[PDB]
Amino acid sequence: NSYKMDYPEMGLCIIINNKNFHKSTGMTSRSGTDVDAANLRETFRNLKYEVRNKNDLTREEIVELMRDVSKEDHSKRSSFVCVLLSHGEEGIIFGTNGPVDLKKITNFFRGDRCRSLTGKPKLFIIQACRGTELDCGIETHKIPVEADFLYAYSTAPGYYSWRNSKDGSWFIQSLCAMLKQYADKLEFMHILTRVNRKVATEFESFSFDATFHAKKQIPCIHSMLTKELYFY
């Protein structure tokens, strides 16, 4: 039915918080991202994850961190969580100096490549753009090596993802709120569905630029999990 979550440790929560980018890249500063990083740290600490925050990592440091983490002994840990806060494009998240393929990052944790996490949920939470589209909205015994991954993307494929410079990103704000409210009673997919509704219904952009004004967002869950996940 459900994943075993009563190992002595819930597991690691790796938070990569990229705010400032090398001038040569031409990428903008991500105001509000520190609000996300603090919110996530508290939220996951409260769920008994061992949280590690890293700020402003190059593309090389990102890859090296994830490799190092995949090489740890996770035998006593129930699960693994990685949160990525950066610029992105479809399939890609940005280090401070350039892009990294998301598949490169997640592949370190494949069932054949990280044995101490085989059969355990590996959760990737991604706040980053997936392209440049804008949503105008509408008035209303072996196991597969790719098994047991969940990718929780902030936005639909092809689309921008929205971040408030004061309040933090729409997705991370909502994710943390729903985890706080529901982690003690809902299964993870149902929590994420509540996140989808919150983002989709409660948020709409405001801009003096007509092209960017009155826009909407829907997060996108990719589940390759084989069991239900309860945090309690």
């Binding site: 992105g88 706040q127 980053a128 921008y160 929205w162 405001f206």
Partner: peptide, 4 residues
């Protein structure tokens, strides 16, 4: 509101 800003985009990533």
């Amino acid at each position: 509101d800003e985009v990533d």
